[PDB]
Design a protein around this ligand. Sequence first.
Ligand code: CLA
Ligand code: CLA
Ligand code: CLA
Ligand code: CLA
Ligand SMILES: CC1=C(C#C/C(C)=C/C=C\C(C)=C\C=C\C=C(C)\C=C\C=C(/C)C#CC2=C(C)C[C@@H](O)CC2(C)C)C(C)(C)C[C@H](O)C1
Ligand SMILES: CC1=C(C#C/C(C)=C/C=C/C(C)=C/C=C/C=C(C)/C=C/C=C(C)/C=C/C2=C(C)CCCC2(C)C)C(C)(C)C[C@H](O)C1
Ligand SMILES: CC1=C(C/C=C(\C)CCC[C@H](C)CCC[C@H](C)CCCC(C)C)C(=O)c2ccccc2C1=O
Ligand code: SF4
Lengths: 42, 68, 170, 742, 166
Amino acid sequence: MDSNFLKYLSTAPVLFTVWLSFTASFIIEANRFFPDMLYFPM
Amino acid sequence: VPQTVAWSAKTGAVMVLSNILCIVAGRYVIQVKGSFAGFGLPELLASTSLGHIVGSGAILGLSYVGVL
Amino acid sequence: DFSAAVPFLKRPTNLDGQYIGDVGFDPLGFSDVFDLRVLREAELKHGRFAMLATLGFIVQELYTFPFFPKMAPVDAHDYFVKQGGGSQIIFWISFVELFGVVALFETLQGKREPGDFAFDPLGLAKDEATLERYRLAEVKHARLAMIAIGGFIHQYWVTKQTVLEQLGNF
Amino acid sequence: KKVSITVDRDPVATSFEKWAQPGHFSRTLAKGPKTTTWIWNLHADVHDFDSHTNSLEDISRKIFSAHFGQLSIIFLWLSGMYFHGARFSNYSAWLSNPTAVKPSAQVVWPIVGQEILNGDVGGGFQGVQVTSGFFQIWRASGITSEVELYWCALAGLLMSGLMIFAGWFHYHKAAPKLEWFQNAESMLNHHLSGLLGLGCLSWAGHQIHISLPVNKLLDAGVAPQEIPLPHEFLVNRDLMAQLYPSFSKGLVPFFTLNWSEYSDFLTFKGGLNPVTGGLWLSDTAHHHLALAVLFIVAGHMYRTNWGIGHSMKEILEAHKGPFTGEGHKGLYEILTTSWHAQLAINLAMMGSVSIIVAHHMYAMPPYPYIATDYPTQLSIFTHHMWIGGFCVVGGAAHAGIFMVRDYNPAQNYNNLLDRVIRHRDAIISHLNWICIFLGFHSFGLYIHNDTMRALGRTQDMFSDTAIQLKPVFAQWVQSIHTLAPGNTTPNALATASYAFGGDVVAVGNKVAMMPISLGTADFMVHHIHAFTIHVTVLILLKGVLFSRNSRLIPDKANLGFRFPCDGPGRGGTCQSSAWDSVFLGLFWMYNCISVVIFHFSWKMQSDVWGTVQADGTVTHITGGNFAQSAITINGWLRDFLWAQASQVIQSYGSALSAYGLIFLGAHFIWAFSLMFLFSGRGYWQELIESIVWAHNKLNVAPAIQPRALSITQGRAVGLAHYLLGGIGTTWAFFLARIISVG
Amino acid sequence: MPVAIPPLGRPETDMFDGSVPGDAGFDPLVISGWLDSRWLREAEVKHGRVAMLAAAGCIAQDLFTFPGVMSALHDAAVKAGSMQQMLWPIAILETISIAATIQMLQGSGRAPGDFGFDPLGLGKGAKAERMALCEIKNGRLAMIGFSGMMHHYFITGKGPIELLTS
Ligand code: CLA
Ligand code: CLA
Ligand code: CLA
Ligand code: CLA
Ligand SMILES: CC1=C(C#C/C(C)=C/C=C\C(C)=C\C=C\C=C(C)\C=C\C=C(/C)C#CC2=C(C)C[C@@H](O)CC2(C)C)C(C)(C)C[C@H](O)C1
Ligand SMILES: CC1=C(C#C/C(C)=C/C=C/C(C)=C/C=C/C=C(C)/C=C/C=C(C)/C=C/C2=C(C)CCCC2(C)C)C(C)(C)C[C@H](O)C1
Ligand SMILES: CC1=C(C/C=C(\C)CCC[C@H](C)CCC[C@H](C)CCCC(C)C)C(=O)c2ccccc2C1=O
Ligand code: SF4
C-alpha cells in the first residue's frame, strides 16, 4: 500500500468519520441485539 | 388546424425561389467570406439553409392564408 | 510501427511485447490510460476463473457428487445461494482475494509479475523456455475460455440444454 | 484554424502525495497549522482557484474538471433515485391506482422504534412517503416496470463513472489550453444547437415514439403489464398507427411540409388532460420539437472557422448611444477573461429560471397525476423557489467578487460599467427611497388592518367588504388569457392554464386546477413580494457597486472582497465588504422566499385545492379563509401559522413524527444560530483563554492553538445555521401539513 | 492532369495533387477544400466497396439462393433475426475501423481504404495503383448501378437482371 495514501487515510477528517461511524455501528448493533435498555439489570 | 398542402410544383417553385433569393442576399450581406468570386461551400450551405427556412415559413404561411 | 495482429492499426506504445501473448491488440487504448500490470492481473484472474468454469460445466454435468441433488449448473447457482455452499465458496474466494490484494500491491511496487502467484507444486516448468511457452498457452486458454464460458451460459439460457446434449442434436 | 483544439498532455501527475499534504494549493496554508483558524481557512478557500494562482489556464482546467466531478455526483444521485424506485418502492401499485396510493421510495430499518416511519402508504406497502415527483416523471416517460427502473439506474451509474473518468482525463492526462476555453462563439453554437437543440429533438423523439402510446394506453385503462414494450412501438408501425393514424403516412408529410397531417400526435390543445390532470403529452411533444428547431436555428448565429456568423464583440461595440458613452464596449473581454462575471450572470439566470419553473409547474401541471398529488406540488414549488433565491444571491456575490478582483479601470473607461459606478449614489438613493415607499405602503396596510380590526372598525380596513384595493391589472390579464382561446390564439382549444379562469379540472374527486381569483389580499401580498425583492436588490446592488471604494473607505478594493471591517474608526466600519452585503442579502432572500411560499401554501389550500362533491361544489382544505384573514398579520398568525401547524405538533406516535422531530430540531438550530449572529469574537477568545488555562493546568493544552472563529466565519456560521433552521422548520411544517390534509 | 470540366478548371486543394488514385479533376463544389482529404477518400472507398457487394448481391441472389428458405428481404430477415446476426460482426469490424480512421486522421502511415489485406498477393508491386484506379472506378460504377436496381425495384417489385430478361 502507498504510504501517501495511508498518510491521507490518517488525516483528522477521515479518521474522525471512520471512528465515529465505528462507534455508531457499535451503539446500533448493541441496541439491535439488546434493545430497550433503560436501566442496568441488577 | 391550419391547412397544409401536399407536395406539388407550386411548393417546389416557392422553395426554389426562396433558396435563390437567399443565395443572392447572402452574396450581398455576408461580411466575412465577378459577383460570385469567393463563393464557397459554407456560404452556399448557409444560404440554402436559410432558403429552406424561409421557404418552409413562406409555404406554411401561404397554405395558412389560402394562396397555397 | 503497426500492430502485429491488426496490420492497419498502429502499435500501442505501451504494448512493446514484454507481456507474453502480446500481438499489439488494443484499439480502444486501455493501455494508454490504465496501468498494464493491473490489466494483466485482471486478464489472468478473469481467464483462470473462466477456465475453471468451463471445466466445471463439463465435469459437473458429466458427474455429480452423491451428497448433492442433481440439477443444471445455472440452477445450481440459485440452489446453492439458499443451501449455503455458495456462501462458503464466496467466503473462501474472498479470503484468498485478500492476499490477492496484497499480491496486487506487490505487483504495483514492481516486486511481482502480474500473474505470478509462485504456484507450481508439480514442478511442470523446469527451465525458462518452458515457462514462456506455458505462459503463452495459459494466456491463450484464458482468453479462449473467457469466450467459451459466456458461450456456454448464454446458449443454455436460450436452448435450456447443456453443452454435451447440444452437441448430440443441433 | 482560429477555433481549434489545443491540449497539453500529462500536465499534472496522478499521485497521492498532495492528498497527504492538506493546504498544498495555497502557499499561506502549505506551511501547516499553528492555530485552529488554519483548519477553517483550509476548508474556506479551497475551491477559490483564482486566489491560489494567477494563471487563467490552470484555473480554467480546474473549473472544467470540477464541473465533471459535479456531473458525476449528479449522475450518481439520479442513479440512486432510479434504483431506490426500482427496489424500495410501491411504483407498480401506484401505476395501478394513482389516485389512492401514496408514492413512497424510502424504507427504514427497524432499530430504535424508527420503523414507525414506515407508514401505510397504500398498495400493500410500508415506507416513507416521497414528494420529489419521480413517480409522475416515470409514468410520463412510459416506464411501466421496475426492470426499466433498474436499467435506468445502471445507465445513471455508468454515466457517473464516465463523468468522473472524464474529469480525471481532462485534468490529469489531457488538459485543454486557455485558447480552447476562450471560444465563446463556438461554445454558444455547440451548446445551443447540440446540447439544447439536439436534446429537445431527441426527447421529442422519445415522447412521440414511446411516451405518447404508452400514456395513451394507460389513460384508456389498460393495465401496465398488458401494455406493449417500447421497442414494439418502435418496430410495429401498425400498432403505432392504431393509436395515431398519421403514422401510417410515415415521414413523407415531414419532408414535404405537409405538417398538418401530424395534427393527431402534435397538437395545440392546451388546458389539461381530464383523465390525469396533467398537460397533454402531444402538446409537450410539439413544444419540445418546436424548441428543438428554434434552438438549432439559434445555434448557427455566432462566427466560427468559416466566414459566416456574428461576432459578439462587434455586436456589443455597435450598441452604444448618447446616454451611455462607449456603450457595451469592453464587456466581451470581461466575459472571456473573468470566470466570476460568467458565474454571476449564469447564477442569476439559473435562479430566475428556477423561480419561473416553480410558478409555471404549479400552474400548468406537466406530469400525469401530479396535480392532485398536493405534497409533490407544494414540495417542488417550495424547493425550486429556494434554489432560485439562493442562485440569484450567488450571482450577486460572484458579481461582487468580479468587481473587487477582476475589474480593471484601464480597460473600462467610460463604458456602461464605469458609468454605473459613476452614478451608484443616484442608483442606491433612488432604490432606497422606493424600498421605503414599498415598505410603508405595503406593510403599513397590514398594520393598518390589524389596528382597524382590533379597534372594532371593520369598515375602515383594506378588504373586499371595506375600502377596496382591487388588483385590476392582474384581473384584466386573467380575463385576456381566459378569452385567448379562439381569439388571440385561434388554434388553441383551451387556455394555457385554468388558473386564469375557466372550468374546474378535477381528477379522482380532487381539484387538479381551478381559477385562482385575485382580491385585496392578493394585491397586498404581491406588493409585499415587490417590496422584499426590491430590498434584496438594494442590499446586493449596494454591496456590488460599493465593493471597490466608497466615501467611507476609499481603498476598499485593497482590503478585498471578504474582510470583516476597517476598524472601529470613522465611527465604525463593521460589515463594510461586499461579502457582508451578500451575508445580509441572504437573510432578506430568506424573508422574501418565506413569504412567497407561505402565500402559495395558503392560497392553494384556501382557494384551489380541495375535494369535489355532488352538485359540483368544491370544498377547499381551509374553506376559503384567505380572502378575509390574509389581510391582517393576526390572520396569518392564527389561520395559517397556528391552524396549519396542528399536524406537525400532533405527529408524535405516527409515521409523520420525523417531521415533528425535524420541526423541533430546526427551531433549535435556528436559535443556536443567534449565538453566532448576536455575539462577537473577543468574548469567545477570552473564554477560550480561560479554557486553555484549564487544559494547561492538566498539561493537555493542544499544539494547534485554539482560537475563536474569525469575524467573517462567525457571520457565516450564524447565517448557515439560521438558514438551515428556518428552511428546515418550514420544510417540516409544510410536509407534515400537506401529507396529512392533502 | 485530367480537367473534368474545362471552364471551372482543377481545384487547388490537398487532393488533386495527382498522387490520389482516381482523380478526374472533378470537384465543382470543392468539398475537398473544406473536409479532410483522407476522410473523404475513406468514405468513397467504403461506399464503393459496400455498393460493389450490394450490386453483386442483387445479381447473385436473383440468380441463386443458398439452400433453406430486396427491401422485402431486409424486412423478412429482420423478422427472422438474420440482419441482427449480420449487423454484429459488421459492427465489430466498424469499431476497429473507427479506431483506424481516428489514427489515420491523427497522422499514422495508413493510406485511406488500405486495410493491409492482400492474401493472394495480386496487389504487391506495380499493379495495385492501377488496381486502385480499377477499384475506385468500379466503386463509382457500383454506386450508380445499385442505385438503379433499388429504385427500379421501387417501380416494379422486381430484380434488375430479372427485369432485363423479362
Ligand atoms: C409568404 C410569406 C409568409 C406569410 C404569408 C406568413 C404568414 C404567417 N406566418 Mg409566417 N413566416 C414566414 C413567411 C410568411 N408567413 C417566414 C419567411 C418565416 C421564417 C421561417 C416565418 C415564420 C413563422 C413562424 C415561426 C410562425 C409564423 C406564423 C404565421 C402566421 C401568423 C399568425 C398571426 O397572426 O401571428 C400571430 C401574431 C401575434 C401578434 C402573436 C405574437 C407572437 C409572440 C407570442 C410574441 C413574441 C414577441 C415578443 C413579445 C417580443 C416583442 C417585444 C419587443 C419590444 C422586443 C401567418 C399565417 C405563426 C404560425 O404559423 O402560427 C400558426 C408562427 O408561429 N411564421
Ligand atoms: C454538441 C456538443 C456539445 C455538447 C453536447 C456539450 C455539452 C455540455 N457541455 Mg460543452 N463544449 C462544447 C460542445 C458541447 N458541449 C464545445 C465545442 C466546447 C468548446 C468551446 C465546450 C466547452 C465546454 C466547457 C468549458 C464546459 C462545457 C460544459 C458542458 C455541460 C454543461 C452542463 C450540463 O447541462 O450537463 C448536463 C447535460 C448532459 C447532456 C449530460 C450528459 C453529458 C455527456 C458528456 C453528453 C454527451 C452526449 C454525446 C455527445 C452524444 C451521446 C448521446 C447519445 C447519442 C448516446 C454539457 C454536458 C460544462 C461542464 O459541465 O463540463 C463538464 C463546462 O464547464 N462545455
Ligand atoms: C454554481 C455555483 C457556485 C460556484 C461554482 C461557486 C464558486 C465559488 N464561490 Mg460561490 N456562491 C454560490 C454559488 C457558487 N459559488 C451561491 C449560490 C452563493 C450564495 C449562497 C454563493 C456565495 C458565495 C460567497 C459569499 C463566497 C463564494 C465564494 C466562492 C469561491 C470559493 C468557494 C469555496 O472555496 O467554498 C468551499 C466550500 C465550502 C466551504 C463548503 C460550504 C458548505 C456549506 C456552507 C454548508 C452546506 C450545508 C448543507 C447543504 C446542508 C447541511 C445540513 C446538515 C448538516 C443537517 C468559488 C469561486 C467565496 C470566495 O471567496 O469567492 C472568491 C465567498 O466568499 N460564493
Ligand atoms: C420585523 C423586523 C424588521 C423591520 C420592521 C425592519 C425594517 C426595515 N429594514 Mg430591516 N432587517 C431586519 C428586520 C427588520 N427590518 C433584520 C432581522 C435584518 C437582519 C439581516 C435586517 C436587515 C436590513 C437591511 C440590510 C436593510 C434593511 C432595511 C429596512 C428598511 C426597509 C424600508 C421599509 O420597509 O420602510 C418602511 C418601514 C417599515 C416597514 C418599518 C415599520 C413601520 C410601519 C409601517 C409602521 C410605522 C408607524 C409609525 C412610524 C408610528 C409612529 C409612532 C411614533 C410614536 C413614533 C426598514 C427600516 C433596508 C433599508 O434600510 O433600506 C431601505 C436595508 O437595506 N434591513
Ligand atoms: C483485397 C483483395 C481481394 C479482394 C476482393 C474482392 C472482394 C473482390 C471484389 C470484386 C468486385 C466486387 C468487383 C466489381 C464489381 C462491380 C459491380 C457489381 C458494379 C456494378 C454492376 C452493375 C452496374 C451491374 C449490372 C447489371 C447486370 C449485369 C444485370 C442486371 O442487374 C442489370 C445491370 C445492367 C444493372 C482478394 C481476397 C481476392 C485478394 C487480392 O489479392 C486482393
Ligand atoms: C446473471 C447470472 C449468471 C450469469 C452469467 C454470466 C457469467 C453470463 C455471461 C458472461 C460472459 C463473460 C459473457 C460473454 C463472453 C464472451 C464473449 C461475448 C466473447 C466474444 C468474443 C468475440 C466476439 C471475439 C472476437 C474476435 C475474434 C473473432 C478474433 C480476433 C479478435 C476479436 C475481434 C476480439 C449466473 C448463472 C452465473 C448466476 C445467476 O444465477 C444469474
Ligand atoms: C460560539 C461562538 C464561537 C465559539 C465557536 C468555537 C470556537 C468553534 C467550535 C468548533 C468545534 C471545535 C468543531 C465542531 C464541534 C463538534 C460539535 C464537537 C467537537 C469535535 C472535536 C473533535 C473538534 C466563536 O468563535 C464566535 C466567533 C465570532 C462570533 C461568534 C462566535 C460564537 O458565537
Ligand atoms: S466590532 Fe469587530 S467588525 Fe466591528 S470594527 Fe470592531 S473588530 Fe471590526
